[PDB]
Symmetry: D3
Subunit: 236 residues, 6 copies
Amino acid sequence: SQPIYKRILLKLSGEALQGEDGLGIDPAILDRMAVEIKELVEMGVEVSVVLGGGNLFRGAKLAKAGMNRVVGDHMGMLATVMNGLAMRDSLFRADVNAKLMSAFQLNGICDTYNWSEAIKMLREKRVVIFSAGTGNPFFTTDSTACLRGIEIEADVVLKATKVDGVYDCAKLYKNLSYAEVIDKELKVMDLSAFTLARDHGMPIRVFNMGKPGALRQVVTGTEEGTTICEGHHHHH
Amino acid sequence: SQPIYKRILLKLSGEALQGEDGLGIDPAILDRMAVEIKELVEMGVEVSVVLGGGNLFRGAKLAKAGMNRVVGDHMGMLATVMNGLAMRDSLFRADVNAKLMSAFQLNGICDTYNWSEAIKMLREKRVVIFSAGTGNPFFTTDSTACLRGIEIEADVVLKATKVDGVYDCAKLYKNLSYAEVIDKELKVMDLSAFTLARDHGMPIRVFNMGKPGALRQVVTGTEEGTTICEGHHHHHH
Amino acid sequence: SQPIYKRILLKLSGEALQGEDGLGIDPAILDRMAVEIKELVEMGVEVSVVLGGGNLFRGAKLAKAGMNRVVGDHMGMLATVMNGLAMRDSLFRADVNAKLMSAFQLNGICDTYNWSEAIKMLREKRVVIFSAGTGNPFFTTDSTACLRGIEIEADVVLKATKVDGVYDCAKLYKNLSYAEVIDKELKVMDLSAFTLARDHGMPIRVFNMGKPGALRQVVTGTEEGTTICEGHHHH
Amino acid sequence: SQPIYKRILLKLSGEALQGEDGLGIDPAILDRMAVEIKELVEMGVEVSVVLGGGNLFRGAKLAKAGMNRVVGDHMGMLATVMNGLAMRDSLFRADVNAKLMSAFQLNGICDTYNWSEAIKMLREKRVVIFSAGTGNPFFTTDSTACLRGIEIEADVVLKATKVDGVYDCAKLYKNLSYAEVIDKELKVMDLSAFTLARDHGMPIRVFNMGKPGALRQVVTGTEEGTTICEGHHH
Amino acid sequence: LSQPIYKRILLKLSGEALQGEDGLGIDPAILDRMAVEIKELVEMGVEVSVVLGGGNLFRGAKLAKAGMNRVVGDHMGMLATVMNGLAMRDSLFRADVNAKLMSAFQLNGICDTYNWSEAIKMLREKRVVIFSAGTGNPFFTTDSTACLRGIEIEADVVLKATKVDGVYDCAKLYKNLSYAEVIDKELKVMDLSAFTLARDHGMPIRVFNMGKPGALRQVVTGTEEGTTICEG
Amino acid sequence: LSQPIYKRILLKLSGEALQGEDGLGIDPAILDRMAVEIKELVEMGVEVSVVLGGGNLFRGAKLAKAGMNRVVGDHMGMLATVMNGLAMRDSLFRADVNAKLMSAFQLNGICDTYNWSEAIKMLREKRVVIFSAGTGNPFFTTDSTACLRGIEIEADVVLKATKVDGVYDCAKLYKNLSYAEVIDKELKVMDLSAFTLARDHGMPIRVFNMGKPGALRQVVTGTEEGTTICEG
């Protein structure tokens, strides 16, 4: 089909980038993602990307050893910049115009995040990657996806997972309201992230990024994955 | 055995923090290192630490795929900050006073490197960790260690390896001049790092950090590892 | 009596600084607060302060006219820095050692926020003021108070209000658990802030700051205001 | 009537955004100003803007209480940024391409002031707003307007006021030289602002911005308000 | 044996005061002479801040005559004051004086960023504080910087170091002047903006011959050396 | 009439290349001459980046002899390269050439902060990019900066401007050399760290006489002017 969105925010966990060796960055996987993003771009979609850092750092063992959680979150924010640099270089090599922004100033490495400049780049049809989360500890990459998504006036947050969407347990939900997710006690994202998306009416699509082709289907149709959005019984 | 140095710069590869499992940061190894450092501090030694990032990022596979080496070197520099943050926390937990300095300003995470601020912290008997290399690509961690050692006026650069020191390939050399290393075509660090140490007369000790007690033996005596310094034939003192 | 906390985070709305004139900063109110903070400091309590900006900027009218909420939030954050500067100066004039930290780097104006530097200053018995929120839009001053409080290892967040505590609407609750606040759908703070406080077990005291003496009572006893903390039925 | 200027710097006091109620930012007044600026842009005029902060912060009370004046000047500078953010948004809502530059770095909020980047944006026909004064205390918004005007090579500094121009208190003066202002002891800016304008030969127009149509008249002709410039005798 | 009459001073030096007999650069022997004189003030409890000019390293006239933008010329001058500042900081360290350099531009890795209350804290800690890069803005002289910094760090006085004994007709030296006198006799002391800033805040000025070893200690420990300018 | 043999160059100039007959500062006529020559490279489609040294404005020798910390001296030199950068940027503007200045140090309000990919973007837009403040670090010559920047921005060549025609024995001029040859014959071209960087990355070097009007154009449009150093 043709795209149903003008501007998306695609959220990928760091683990999206790992190979069967389940660690670091797999170049073949990253280059596949770059070609998939290229085809949305040549479809005319404005693409922003938020990456986590869990392929490069998981702090559980250090936390168990007594590491301060603030320090663990900082390490993780740095890991997202490293992932963002790799994606930016992968996009360049696929001949896609791309820019990396970071919550922290990183002079000589990338751009500093600025919401109005990001929208300006997106409207220039550059892919914008957001790294370093929000600069603060105790806030998930999901919270960052929702925050950035709302700031850059994206139409939707695409939550890339390793599963087909949201299940009860196994039956896949196609459409859920924010109220239903809460009522049925389902797992979508942490309550803080979900609450930001809800208060601002940002719809979320949860889909399987590991299925080559799934991303294009999400962007061009209603059928792939699970959609979470505002219930019908409020406004018209 | 008392310390023969007042101020040291310890260079560790990121791989020194790595577990036998073969990646990342092993909290037992890291905590073992914090205890060893703590025992240098309680001997009156002023300690600075330069960390690499190869336990967290090896660029080979991405490089062969065509990644720009500038970008690969930025990723590696960010990886050294992550090790520095781990090390600072480890030292804190061992009740060692420690600061992390970064060649990139990182507001809210750590201090921005300044040579005379670092000297001041070292005189106050704080351990200073240096991360993010020199801010620039194409320069090794060994080159960072020599550069920082020169700037903060360390007595020596200690190059922690997984070997007992510098061999033919096998005999271990105890003492070498800068001229000998080049004449015998021995590999000690990269040419730029070595060149910098050489021009400034910075002595280097290559030792096995993996041996417990080795760091203490290196700081309190002449026998452990291989020493590289200026030969006697240029001047008297 | 004697203080029950070692380290507090005191959250004041910008509206706590206002007079009967309905806007701005009232120097007499500000100086009363500074003397009240001085008396905690000389009791040995380490005090950090989070200030809102609502006395200087109310965005509702501009929002009505179409102003982008990101922009409204940025304005509000700048307003907290102005309040923070007024408080720092008021503390100096009451001979209390204080420092202002900001989420944004403001070269020449104040210090850049850094959690471990703030703890070091608190350990030095300096009062640390936190301004510019988290540097991000869509996150309340209550959220900032809980985030900063958790980061600097405060014992409690004191939520200064103009009411006595949390009411059923009226009977004043003395003690509530997090589970109870949600069960009875009471309003304490926004769900984001409350959730952050709840997941880290940060207790909250809601009290009447506009009652002179109530802050010292809160810091030295269990009786003033409403306590919100983890319920007993967990461990 | 057509513009007599290629590039202007419009100096607005914070109190120009103020509602008749007396405080803060009145959206109607603010959006009226954006429409007037848009019509300057639509005539080909390159517009820069300098905003004061006295609608959001007046430090008289805190100062009598003992507040350090450095601290008071920093609060005022931050208030000019808040005004600048509001102005940038209003211009955006009037479909005018506008940028905010601050004398302080404010990562995430706006651009950092750079004189040649500002000239480049003005040549691209973007409205550039300057906030946070010069980053230093003890210097008026008038001094900021003159400094920025000189740096970005404005043709003129327009000083928006609530009066029709400079008076005896009353004759309105039409044209004054710098030497006439000092010789007649008239009050136009503070001495350091006027001195800077004078030394650099920057003309100033003092006019009633509270009169709808006046801004357009000032830019398209010589009659509205009071002009202060270098005398013919040098 | 004479004791200090000031608790906190701001000493303004032109860049030309560090110049050698070869009339240029930085003369190490002049600079080390000044480090010894500043150390003498420190060991008597005087809190010392220093503003340096850049004219020994950059004079803009030739480039300006060729058409160089005055902003650009002022930016080049600001950077030259930082170079002088770094030499002065190093000179003070070699004389065993605790000294810090603050710049109007954040210069990561080189020196501190200027902050008025941090500078006051350092002055109370009995550290010498050097201010460089002026105010960060063009069209403002080093004299305006001296007056502004002096006011901000709450100095008792601004000492304007020169190569002559004080303020003259050109040959009669004045000893005392009011701000009003200076303006009415059209005497040359500093630019109108700088002078007006000192006037409105009641900052007194002392104009003296720093060229003379001895003069600085004399100015700080007595009222007679040089020309004193204060409110009438 | 000869066409360019390079698409993208990095032109290293010593600070001394801008000094006048009187052997100091910045000569506006020399600077404007160089601006005209750069403009003709740009007019032919060559992408031009420029690294500048600081020795016309600061030489550390005397201060170093007196005991100045070499770090501090290297910081002073770096700031001197920005001053040169600012003069060159203004000179190019006056010749009607689009140019940008980038600094290793963030200098808010003065110039751009260095970023490799942003420099490349500007070079593709046919802007001249001047690099100042070196790497930000001490103990690294301007030649090392030239090599490093050249590599980062993917220049075809590093043109080392000098006051002589090429690389000599001391007097025979060499036209062609390998990196091996230079090291074996111990020829003076640049320090070992800079040269080693050029070598390991295969960056060719041209050593020419920028003192001669016309030589820059000859070097960019022909293979015979000066000395060429490349991989054997």
